[PDB]
Coordinates of N, CA and C (backbone and C1' of nucleotides) in Angstrom, one line a residue:
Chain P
X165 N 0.8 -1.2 0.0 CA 0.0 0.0 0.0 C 0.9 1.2 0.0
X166 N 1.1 2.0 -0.7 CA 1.2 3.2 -1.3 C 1.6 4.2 0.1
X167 N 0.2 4.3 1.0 CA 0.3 5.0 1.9 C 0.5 4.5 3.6
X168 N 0.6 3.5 3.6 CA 0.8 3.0 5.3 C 2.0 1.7 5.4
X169 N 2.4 0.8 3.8 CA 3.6 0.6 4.1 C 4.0 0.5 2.6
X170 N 4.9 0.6 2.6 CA 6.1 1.0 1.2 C 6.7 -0.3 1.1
X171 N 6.9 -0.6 -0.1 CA 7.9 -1.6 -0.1 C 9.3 -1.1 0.2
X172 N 9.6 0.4 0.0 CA 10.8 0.7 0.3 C 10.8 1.0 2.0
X173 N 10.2 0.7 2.6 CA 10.1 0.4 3.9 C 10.5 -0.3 4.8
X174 N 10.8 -1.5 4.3 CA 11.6 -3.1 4.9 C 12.6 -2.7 5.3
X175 N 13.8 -1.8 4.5 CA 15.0 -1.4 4.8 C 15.1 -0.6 6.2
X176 N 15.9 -0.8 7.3 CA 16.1 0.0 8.5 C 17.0 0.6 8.2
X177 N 16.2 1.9 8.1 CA 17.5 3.1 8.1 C 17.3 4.3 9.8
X178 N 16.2 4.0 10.2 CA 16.4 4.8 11.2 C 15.5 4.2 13.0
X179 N 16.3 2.8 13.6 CA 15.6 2.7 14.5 C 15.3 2.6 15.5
X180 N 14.0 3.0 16.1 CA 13.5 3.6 17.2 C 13.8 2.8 18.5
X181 N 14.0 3.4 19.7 CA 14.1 2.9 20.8 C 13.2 2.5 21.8
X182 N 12.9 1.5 22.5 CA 11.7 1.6 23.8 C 12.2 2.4 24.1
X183 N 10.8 3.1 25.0 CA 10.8 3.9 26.4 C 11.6 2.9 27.7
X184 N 11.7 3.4 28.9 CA 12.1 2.6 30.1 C 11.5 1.4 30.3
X185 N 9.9 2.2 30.1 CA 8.7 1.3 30.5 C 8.5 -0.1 30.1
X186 N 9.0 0.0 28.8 CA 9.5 -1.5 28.0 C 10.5 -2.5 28.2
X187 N 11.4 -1.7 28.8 CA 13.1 -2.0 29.5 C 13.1 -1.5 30.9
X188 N 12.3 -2.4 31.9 CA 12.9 -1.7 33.4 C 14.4 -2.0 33.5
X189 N 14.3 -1.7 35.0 CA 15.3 -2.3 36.0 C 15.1 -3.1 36.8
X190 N 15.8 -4.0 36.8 CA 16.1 -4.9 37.9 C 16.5 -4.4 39.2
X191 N 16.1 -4.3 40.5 CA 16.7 -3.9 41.4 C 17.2 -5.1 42.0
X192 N 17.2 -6.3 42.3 CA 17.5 -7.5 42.5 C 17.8 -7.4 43.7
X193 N 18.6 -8.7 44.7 CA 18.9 -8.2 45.8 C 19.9 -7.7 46.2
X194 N 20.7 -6.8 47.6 CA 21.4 -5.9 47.3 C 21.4 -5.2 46.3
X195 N 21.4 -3.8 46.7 CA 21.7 -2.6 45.7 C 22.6 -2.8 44.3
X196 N 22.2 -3.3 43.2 CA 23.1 -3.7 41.9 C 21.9 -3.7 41.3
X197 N 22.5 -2.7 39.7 CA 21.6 -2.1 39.0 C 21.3 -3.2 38.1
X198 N 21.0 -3.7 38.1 CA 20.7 -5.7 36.7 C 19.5 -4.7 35.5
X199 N 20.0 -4.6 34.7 CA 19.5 -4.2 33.6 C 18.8 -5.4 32.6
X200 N 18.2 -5.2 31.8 CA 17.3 -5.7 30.8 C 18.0 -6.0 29.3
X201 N 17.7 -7.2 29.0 CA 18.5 -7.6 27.6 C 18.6 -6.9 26.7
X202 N 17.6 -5.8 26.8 CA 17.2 -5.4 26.0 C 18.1 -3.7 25.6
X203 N 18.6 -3.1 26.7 CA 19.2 -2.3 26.5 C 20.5 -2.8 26.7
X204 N 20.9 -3.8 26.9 CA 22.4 -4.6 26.8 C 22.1 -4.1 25.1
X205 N 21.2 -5.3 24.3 CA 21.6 -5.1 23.1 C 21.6 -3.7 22.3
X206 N 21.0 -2.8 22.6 CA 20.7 -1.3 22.3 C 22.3 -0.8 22.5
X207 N 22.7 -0.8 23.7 CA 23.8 -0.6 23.7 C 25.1 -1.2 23.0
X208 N 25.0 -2.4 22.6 CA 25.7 -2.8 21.6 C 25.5 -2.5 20.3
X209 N 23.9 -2.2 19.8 CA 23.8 -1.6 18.5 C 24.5 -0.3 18.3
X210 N 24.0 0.7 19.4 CA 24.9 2.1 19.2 C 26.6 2.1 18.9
X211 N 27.2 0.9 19.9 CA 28.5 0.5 19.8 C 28.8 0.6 18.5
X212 N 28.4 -0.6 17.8 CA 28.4 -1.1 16.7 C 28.3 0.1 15.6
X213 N 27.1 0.8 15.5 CA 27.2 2.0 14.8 C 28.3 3.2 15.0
X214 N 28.3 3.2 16.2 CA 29.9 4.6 16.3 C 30.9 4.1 15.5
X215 N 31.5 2.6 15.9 CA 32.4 2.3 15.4 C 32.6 2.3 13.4
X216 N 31.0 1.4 13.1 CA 31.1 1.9 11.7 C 31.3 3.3 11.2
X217 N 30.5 4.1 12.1 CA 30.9 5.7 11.6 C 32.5 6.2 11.4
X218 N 32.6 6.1 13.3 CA 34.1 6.0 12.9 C 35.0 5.1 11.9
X219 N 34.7 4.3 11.3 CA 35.6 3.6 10.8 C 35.7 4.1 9.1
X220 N 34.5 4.4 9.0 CA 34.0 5.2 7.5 C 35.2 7.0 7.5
Chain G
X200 N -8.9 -52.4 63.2 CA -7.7 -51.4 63.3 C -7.2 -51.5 61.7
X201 N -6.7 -50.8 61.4 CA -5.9 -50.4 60.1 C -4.7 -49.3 60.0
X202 N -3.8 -49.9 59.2 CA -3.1 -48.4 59.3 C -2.9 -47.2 58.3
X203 N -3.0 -46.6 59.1 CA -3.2 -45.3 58.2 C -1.8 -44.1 58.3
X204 N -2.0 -43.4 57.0 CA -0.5 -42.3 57.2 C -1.3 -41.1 57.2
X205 N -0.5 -40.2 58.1 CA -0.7 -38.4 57.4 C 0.3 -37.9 55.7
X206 N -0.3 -37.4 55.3 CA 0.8 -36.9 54.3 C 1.2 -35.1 54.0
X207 N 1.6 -34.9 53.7 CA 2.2 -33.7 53.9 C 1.7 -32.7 53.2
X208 N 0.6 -32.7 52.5 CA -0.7 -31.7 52.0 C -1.8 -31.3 53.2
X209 N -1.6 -30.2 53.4 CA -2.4 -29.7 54.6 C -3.2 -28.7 53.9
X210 N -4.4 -28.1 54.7 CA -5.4 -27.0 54.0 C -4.8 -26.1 54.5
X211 N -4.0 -25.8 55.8 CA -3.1 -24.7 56.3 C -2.1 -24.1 54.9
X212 N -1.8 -25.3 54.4 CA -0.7 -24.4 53.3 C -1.0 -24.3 52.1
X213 N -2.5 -24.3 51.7 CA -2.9 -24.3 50.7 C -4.1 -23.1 50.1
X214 N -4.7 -22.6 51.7 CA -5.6 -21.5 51.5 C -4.9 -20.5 51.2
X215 N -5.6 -19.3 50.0 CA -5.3 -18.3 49.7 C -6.5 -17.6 49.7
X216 N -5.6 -16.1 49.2 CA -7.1 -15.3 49.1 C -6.4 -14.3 49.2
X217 N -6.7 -13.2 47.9 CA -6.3 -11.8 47.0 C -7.3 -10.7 46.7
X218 N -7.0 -9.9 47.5 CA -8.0 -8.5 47.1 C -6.5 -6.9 46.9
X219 N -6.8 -7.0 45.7 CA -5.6 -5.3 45.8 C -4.3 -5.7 46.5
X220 N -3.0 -6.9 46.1 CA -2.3 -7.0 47.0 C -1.0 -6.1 46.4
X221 N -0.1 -6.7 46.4 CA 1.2 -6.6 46.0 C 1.1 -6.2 44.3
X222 N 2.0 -5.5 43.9 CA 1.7 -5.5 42.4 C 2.9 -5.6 41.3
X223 N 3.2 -6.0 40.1 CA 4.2 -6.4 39.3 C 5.3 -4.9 38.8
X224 N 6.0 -5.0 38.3 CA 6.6 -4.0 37.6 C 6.4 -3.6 36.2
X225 N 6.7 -5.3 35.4 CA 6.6 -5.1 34.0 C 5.7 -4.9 33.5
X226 N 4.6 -6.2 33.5 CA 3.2 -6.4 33.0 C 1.9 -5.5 33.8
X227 N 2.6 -4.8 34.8 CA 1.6 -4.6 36.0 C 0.2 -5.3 36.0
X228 N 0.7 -6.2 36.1 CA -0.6 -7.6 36.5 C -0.1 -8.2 37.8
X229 N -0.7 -9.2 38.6 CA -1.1 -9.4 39.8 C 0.4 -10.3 40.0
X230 N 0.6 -10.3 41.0 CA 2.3 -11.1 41.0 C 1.5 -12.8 41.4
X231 N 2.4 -13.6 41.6 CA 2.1 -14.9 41.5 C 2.1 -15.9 42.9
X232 N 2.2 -16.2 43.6 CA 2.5 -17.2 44.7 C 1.7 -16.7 46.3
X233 N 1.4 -17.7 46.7 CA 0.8 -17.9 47.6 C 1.7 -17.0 48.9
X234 N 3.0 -17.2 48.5 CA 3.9 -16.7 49.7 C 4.1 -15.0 49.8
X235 N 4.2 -14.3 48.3 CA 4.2 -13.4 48.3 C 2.8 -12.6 48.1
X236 N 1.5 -13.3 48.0 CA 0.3 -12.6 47.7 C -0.1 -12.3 46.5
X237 N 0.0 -13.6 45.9 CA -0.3 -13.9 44.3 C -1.7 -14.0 44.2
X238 N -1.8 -13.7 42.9 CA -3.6 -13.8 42.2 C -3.6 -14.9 41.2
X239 N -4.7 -15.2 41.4 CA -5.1 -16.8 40.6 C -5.1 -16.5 39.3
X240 N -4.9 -17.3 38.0 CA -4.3 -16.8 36.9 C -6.2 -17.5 35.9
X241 N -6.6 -16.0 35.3 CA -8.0 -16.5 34.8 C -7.3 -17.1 33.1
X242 N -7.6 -18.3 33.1 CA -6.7 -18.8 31.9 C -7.6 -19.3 30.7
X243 N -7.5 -19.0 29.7 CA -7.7 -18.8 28.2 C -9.0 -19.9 28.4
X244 N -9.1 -21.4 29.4 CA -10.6 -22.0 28.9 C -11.1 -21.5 30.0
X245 N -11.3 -20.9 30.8 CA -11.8 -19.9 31.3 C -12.4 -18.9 30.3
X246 N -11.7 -18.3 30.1 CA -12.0 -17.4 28.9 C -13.3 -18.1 27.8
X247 N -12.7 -18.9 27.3 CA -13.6 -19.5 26.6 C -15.6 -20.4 26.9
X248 N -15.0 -20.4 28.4 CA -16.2 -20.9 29.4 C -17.2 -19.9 29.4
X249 N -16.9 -18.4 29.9 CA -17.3 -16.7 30.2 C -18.2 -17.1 29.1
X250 N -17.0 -16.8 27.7 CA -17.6 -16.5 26.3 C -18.8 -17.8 25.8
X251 N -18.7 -18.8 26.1 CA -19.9 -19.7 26.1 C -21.3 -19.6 26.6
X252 N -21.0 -19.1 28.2 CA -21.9 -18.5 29.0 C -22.8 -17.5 28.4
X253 N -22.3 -16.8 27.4 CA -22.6 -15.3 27.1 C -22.4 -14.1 28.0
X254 N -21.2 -14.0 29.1 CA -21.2 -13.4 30.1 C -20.5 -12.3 29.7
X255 N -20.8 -10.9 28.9 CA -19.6 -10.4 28.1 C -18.7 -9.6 29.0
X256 N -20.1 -9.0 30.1 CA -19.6 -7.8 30.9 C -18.9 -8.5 32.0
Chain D
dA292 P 7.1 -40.1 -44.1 O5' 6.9 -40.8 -42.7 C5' 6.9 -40.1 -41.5 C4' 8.4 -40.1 -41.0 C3' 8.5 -39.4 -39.7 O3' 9.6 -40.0 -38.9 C1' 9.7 -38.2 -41.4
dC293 P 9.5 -40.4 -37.4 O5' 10.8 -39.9 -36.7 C5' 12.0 -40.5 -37.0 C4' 13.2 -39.6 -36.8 C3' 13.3 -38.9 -35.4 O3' 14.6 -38.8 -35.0 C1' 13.1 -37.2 -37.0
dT294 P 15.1 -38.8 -33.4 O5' 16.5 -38.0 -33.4 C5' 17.6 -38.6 -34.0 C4' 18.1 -37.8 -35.1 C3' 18.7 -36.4 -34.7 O3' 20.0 -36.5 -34.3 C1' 17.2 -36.2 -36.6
dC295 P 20.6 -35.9 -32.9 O5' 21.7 -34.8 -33.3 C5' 21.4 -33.8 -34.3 C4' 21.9 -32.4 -33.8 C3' 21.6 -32.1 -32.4 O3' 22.6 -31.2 -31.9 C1' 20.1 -30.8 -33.7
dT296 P 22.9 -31.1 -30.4 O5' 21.5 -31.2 -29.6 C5' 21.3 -30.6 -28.4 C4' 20.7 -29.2 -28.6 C3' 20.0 -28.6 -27.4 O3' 20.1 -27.2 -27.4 C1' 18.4 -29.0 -29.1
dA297 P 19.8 -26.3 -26.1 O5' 18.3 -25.7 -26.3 C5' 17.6 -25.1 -25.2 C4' 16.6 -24.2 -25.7 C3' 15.5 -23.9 -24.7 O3' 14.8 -22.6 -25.1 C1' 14.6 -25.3 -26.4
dC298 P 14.4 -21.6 -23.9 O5' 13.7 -22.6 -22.8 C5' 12.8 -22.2 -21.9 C4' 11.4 -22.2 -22.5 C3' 10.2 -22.4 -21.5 O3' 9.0 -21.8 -22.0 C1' 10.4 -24.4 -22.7
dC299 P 7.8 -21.5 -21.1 O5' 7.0 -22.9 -21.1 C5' 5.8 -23.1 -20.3 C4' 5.0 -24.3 -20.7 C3' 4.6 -25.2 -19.6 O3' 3.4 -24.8 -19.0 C1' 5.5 -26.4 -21.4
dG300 P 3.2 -24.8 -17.5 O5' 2.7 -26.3 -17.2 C5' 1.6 -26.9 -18.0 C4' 1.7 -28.4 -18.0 C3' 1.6 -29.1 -16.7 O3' 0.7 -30.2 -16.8 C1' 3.6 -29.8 -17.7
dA301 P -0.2 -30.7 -15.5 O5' 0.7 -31.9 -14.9 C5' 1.0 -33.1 -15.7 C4' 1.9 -34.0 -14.9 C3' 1.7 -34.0 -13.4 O3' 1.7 -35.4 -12.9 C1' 4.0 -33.7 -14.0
dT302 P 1.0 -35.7 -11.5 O5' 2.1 -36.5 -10.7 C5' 3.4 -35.9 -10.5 C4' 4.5 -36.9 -10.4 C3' 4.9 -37.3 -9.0 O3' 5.4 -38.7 -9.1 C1' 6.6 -36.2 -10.1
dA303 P 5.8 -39.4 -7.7 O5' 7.3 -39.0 -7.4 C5' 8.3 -39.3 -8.3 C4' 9.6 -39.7 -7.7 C3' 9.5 -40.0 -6.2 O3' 10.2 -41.2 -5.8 C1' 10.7 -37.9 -6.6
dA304 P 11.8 -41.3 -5.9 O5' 12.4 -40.2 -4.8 C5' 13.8 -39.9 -4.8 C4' 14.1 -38.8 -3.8 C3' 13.4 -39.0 -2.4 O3' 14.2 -39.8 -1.5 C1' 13.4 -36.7 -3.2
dG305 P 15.8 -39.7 -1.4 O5' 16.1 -38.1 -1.5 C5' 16.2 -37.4 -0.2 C4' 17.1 -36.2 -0.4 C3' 17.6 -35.5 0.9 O3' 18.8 -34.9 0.7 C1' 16.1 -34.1 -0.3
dC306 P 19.6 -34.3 1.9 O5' 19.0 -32.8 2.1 C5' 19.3 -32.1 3.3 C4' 18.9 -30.6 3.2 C3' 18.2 -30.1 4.4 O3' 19.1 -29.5 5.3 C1' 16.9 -29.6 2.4
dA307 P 18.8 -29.5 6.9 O5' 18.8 -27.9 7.2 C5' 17.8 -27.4 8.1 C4' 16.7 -26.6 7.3 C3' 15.7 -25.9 8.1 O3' 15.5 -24.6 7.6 C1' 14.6 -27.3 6.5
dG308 P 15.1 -23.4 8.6 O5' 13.5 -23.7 8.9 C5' 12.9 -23.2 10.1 C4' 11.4 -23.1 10.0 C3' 10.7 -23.2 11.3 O3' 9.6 -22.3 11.3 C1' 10.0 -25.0 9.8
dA309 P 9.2 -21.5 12.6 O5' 7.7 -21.8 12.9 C5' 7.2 -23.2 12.8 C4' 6.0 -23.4 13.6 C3' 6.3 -23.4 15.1 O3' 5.1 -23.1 15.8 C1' 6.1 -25.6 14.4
dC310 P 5.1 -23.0 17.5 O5' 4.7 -24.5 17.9 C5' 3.5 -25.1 17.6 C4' 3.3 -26.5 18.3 C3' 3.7 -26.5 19.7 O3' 2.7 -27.1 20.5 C1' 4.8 -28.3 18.5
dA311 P 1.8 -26.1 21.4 O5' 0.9 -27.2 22.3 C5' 1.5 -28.0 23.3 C4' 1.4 -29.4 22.9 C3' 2.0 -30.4 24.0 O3' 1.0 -30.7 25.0 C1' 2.8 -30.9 21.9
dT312 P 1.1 -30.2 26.5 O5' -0.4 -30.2 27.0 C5' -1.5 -29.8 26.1 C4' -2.7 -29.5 26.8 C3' -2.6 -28.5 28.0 O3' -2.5 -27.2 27.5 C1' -4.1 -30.3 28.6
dA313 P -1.7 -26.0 28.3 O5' -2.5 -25.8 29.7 C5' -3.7 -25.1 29.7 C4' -4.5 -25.2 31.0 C3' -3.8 -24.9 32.2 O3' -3.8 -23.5 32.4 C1' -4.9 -26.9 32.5
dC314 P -2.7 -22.7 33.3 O5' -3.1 -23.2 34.8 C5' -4.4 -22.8 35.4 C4' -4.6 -23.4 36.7 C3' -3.5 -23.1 37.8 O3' -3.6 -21.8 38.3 C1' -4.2 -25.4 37.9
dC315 P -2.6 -20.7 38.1 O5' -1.3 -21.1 39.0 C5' -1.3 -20.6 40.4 C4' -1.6 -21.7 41.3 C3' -0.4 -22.1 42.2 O3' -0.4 -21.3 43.4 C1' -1.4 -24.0 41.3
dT316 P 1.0 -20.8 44.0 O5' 1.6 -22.0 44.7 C5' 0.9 -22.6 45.8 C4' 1.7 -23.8 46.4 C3' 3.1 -23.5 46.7 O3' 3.3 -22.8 47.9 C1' 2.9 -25.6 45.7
dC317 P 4.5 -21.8 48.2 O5' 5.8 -22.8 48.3 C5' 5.9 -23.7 49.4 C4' 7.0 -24.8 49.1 C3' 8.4 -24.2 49.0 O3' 9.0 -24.1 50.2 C1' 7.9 -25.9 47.3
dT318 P 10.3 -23.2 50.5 O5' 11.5 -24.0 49.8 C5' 11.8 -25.3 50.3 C4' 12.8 -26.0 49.4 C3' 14.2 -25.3 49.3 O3' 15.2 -26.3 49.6 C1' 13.4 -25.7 47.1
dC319 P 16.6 -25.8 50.2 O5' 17.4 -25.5 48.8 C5' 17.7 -26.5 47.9 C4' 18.5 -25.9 46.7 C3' 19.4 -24.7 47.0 O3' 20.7 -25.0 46.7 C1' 18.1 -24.4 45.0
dG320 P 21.9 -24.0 47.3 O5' 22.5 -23.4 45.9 C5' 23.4 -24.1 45.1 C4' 23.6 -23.5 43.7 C3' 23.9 -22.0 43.7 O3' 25.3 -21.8 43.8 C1' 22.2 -22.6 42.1
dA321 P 26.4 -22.1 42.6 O5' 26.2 -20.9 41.6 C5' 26.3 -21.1 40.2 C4' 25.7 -20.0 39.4 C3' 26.3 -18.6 39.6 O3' 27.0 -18.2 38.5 C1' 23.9 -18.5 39.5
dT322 P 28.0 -16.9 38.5 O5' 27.0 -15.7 38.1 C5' 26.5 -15.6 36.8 C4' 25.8 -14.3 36.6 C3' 26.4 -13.1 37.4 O3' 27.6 -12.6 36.8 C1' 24.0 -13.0 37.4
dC323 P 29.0 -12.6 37.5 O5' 30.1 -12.4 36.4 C5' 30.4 -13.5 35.5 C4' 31.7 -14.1 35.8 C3' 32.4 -13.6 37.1 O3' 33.0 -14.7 37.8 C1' 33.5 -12.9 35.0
dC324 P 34.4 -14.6 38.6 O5' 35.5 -14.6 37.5 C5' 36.8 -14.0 37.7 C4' 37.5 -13.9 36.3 C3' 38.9 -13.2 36.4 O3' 39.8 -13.9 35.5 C1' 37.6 -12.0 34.9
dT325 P 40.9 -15.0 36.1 O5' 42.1 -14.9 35.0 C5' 41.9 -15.3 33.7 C4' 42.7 -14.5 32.7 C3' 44.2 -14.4 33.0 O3' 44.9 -14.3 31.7 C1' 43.3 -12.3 33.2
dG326 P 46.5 -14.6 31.6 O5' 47.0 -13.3 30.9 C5' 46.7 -13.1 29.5 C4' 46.7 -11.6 29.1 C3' 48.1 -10.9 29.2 O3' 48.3 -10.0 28.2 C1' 46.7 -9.8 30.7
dT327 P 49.6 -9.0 28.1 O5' 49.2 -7.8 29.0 C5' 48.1 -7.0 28.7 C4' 48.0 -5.7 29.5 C3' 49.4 -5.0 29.8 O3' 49.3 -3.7 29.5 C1' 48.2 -5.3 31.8
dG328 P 50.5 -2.9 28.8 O5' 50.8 -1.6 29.7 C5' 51.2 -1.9 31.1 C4' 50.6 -0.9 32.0 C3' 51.5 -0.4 33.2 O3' 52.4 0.6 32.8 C1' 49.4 -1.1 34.0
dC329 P 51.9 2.2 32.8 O5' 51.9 2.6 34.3 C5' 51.9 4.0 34.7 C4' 53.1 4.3 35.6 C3' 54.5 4.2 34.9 O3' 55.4 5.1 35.3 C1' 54.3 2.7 36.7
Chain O
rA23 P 16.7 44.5 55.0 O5' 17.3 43.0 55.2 C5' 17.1 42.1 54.2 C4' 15.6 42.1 53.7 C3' 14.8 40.8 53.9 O3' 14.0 40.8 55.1 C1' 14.8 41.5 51.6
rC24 P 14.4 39.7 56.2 O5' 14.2 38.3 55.4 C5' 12.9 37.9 54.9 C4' 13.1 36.9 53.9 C3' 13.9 35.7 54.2 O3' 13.2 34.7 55.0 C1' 14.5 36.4 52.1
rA25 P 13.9 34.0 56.2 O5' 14.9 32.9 55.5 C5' 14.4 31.9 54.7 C4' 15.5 31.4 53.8 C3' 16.8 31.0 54.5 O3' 16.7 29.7 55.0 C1' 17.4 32.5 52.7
rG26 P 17.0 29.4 56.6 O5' 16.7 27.9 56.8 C5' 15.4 27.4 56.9 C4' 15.3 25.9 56.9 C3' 16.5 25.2 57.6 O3' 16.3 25.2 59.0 C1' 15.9 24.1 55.6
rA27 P 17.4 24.5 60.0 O5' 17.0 23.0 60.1 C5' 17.9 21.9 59.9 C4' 17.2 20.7 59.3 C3' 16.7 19.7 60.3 O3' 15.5 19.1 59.7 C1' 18.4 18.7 59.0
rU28 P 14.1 19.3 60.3 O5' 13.4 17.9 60.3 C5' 14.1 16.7 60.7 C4' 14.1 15.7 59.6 C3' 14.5 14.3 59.9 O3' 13.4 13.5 60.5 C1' 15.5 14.9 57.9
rC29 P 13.2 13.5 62.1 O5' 11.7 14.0 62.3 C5' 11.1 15.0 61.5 C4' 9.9 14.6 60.7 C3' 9.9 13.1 60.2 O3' 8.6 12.6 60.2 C1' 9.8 14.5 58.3
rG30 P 7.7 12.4 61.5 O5' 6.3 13.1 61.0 C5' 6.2 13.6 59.7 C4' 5.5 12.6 58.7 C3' 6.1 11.2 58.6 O3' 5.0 10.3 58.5 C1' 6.0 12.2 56.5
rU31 P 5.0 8.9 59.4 O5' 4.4 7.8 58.4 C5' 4.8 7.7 57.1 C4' 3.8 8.2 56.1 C3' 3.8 7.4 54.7 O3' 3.1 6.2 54.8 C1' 3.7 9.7 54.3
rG32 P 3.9 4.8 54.6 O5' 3.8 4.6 53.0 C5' 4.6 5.3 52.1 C4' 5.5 4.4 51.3 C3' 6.4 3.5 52.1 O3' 6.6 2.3 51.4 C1' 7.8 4.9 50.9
rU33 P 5.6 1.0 51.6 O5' 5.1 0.7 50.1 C5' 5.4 1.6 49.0 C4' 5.9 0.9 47.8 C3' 6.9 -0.3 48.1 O3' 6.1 -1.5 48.4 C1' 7.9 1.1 46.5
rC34 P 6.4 -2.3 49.8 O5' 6.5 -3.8 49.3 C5' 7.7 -4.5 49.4 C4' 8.2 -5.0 48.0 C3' 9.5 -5.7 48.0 O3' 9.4 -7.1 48.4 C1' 9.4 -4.1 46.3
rC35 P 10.0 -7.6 49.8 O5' 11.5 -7.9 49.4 C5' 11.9 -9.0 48.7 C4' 12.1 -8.6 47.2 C3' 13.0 -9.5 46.4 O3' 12.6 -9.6 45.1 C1' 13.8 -7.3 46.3
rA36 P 11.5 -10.8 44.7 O5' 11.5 -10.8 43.1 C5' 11.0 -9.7 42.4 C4' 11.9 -9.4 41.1 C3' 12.1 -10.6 40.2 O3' 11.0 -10.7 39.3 C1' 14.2 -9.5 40.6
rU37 P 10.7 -12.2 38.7 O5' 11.8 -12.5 37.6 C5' 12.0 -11.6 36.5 C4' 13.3 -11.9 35.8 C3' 13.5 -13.4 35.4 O3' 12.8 -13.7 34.2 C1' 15.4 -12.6 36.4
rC38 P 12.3 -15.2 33.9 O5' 13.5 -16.0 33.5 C5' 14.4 -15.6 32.5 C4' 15.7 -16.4 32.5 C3' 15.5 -17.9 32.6 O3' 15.2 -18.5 31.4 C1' 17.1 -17.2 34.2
rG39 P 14.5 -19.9 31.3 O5' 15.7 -20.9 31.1 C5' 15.6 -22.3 31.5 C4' 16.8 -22.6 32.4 C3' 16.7 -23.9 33.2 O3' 16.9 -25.1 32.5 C1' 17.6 -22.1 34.5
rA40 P 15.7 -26.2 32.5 O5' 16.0 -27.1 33.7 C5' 17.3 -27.6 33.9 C4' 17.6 -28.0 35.3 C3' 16.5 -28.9 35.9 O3' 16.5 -30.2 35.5 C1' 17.1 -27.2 37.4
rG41 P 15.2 -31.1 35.3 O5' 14.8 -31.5 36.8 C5' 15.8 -32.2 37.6 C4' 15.5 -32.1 39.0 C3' 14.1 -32.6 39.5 O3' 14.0 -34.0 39.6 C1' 14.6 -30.6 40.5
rA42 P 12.7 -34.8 39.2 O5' 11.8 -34.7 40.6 C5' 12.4 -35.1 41.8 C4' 11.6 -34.6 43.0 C3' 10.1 -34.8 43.0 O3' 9.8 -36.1 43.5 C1' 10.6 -32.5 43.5
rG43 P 8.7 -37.0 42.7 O5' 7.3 -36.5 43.3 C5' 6.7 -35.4 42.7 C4' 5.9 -34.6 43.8 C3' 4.4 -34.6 43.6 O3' 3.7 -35.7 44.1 C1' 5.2 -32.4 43.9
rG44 P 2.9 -36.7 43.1 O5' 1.4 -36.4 43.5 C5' 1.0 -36.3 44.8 C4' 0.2 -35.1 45.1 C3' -1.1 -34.9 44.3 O3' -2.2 -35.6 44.8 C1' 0.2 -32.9 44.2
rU45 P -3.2 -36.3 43.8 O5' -4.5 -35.4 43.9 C5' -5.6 -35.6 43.0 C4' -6.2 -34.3 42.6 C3' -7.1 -34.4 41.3 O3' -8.4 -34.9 41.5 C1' -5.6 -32.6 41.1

DNA sequence: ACTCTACCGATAAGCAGACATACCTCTCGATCCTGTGC
RNA sequence: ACAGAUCGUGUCCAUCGAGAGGU
């Protein structure tokens, strides 16, 4: 469809992040911040992109 | 006479009962276990029981 | 008349994909470091 | 000019696997 998906669409060129609300925190026991898989991987995607930037 | 055993299922450790307790983080849905003040989980033939009944509300 | 080889249809046979009743109860472990620094 | 000690209410310890169970 023309106007709500594109076939030039499929390609990721720009993407979006959850809120927190999607990715808590773990408080776990004792005080240690245990994060969510999910911004582990987020934060390896950005890795991953600086480095291509930089590398370009 | 006959012999008989106790076994280790008691109604002491099995009654519950949940009004507004404790509440989840992620799903904010009812947390689970009898020890922490968990809510009974209404599960899908349930669901389908209601919808049988015609019970919508 | 069917040789010299092309696309039509019609199968065989191997390559992977999805998934297995429902309810709750309890206990028990694990959630990093070694080469490298002056 | 003005320019505070906490007080008062306070939210929980989670996740992943493994095992034993009972209708």
């Amino acid at each position: 469809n023309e106007v709500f998906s594109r076939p030039e669409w499929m390609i990721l060129t720009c993407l979006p992040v959850p809120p927190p609300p999607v990715r808590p925190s773990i408080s776990f026991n004792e005080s240690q911040r245990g994060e969510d898989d999910l911004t582990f991987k987020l934060a390896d995607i950005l890795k991953a992109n600086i480095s291509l930037e930089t590398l370009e | 006479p006959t012999y008989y055993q106790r076994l280790r299922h008691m109604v002491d450790d099995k009654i519950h009962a949940r009004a507004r307790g404790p509440m989840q983080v992620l799903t904010r849905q009812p947390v689970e276990g009898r020890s922490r003040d968990g809510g009974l989980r209404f599960g899908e033939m349930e669901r389908d029981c209601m919808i049988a009944h015609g019970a919508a509300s």
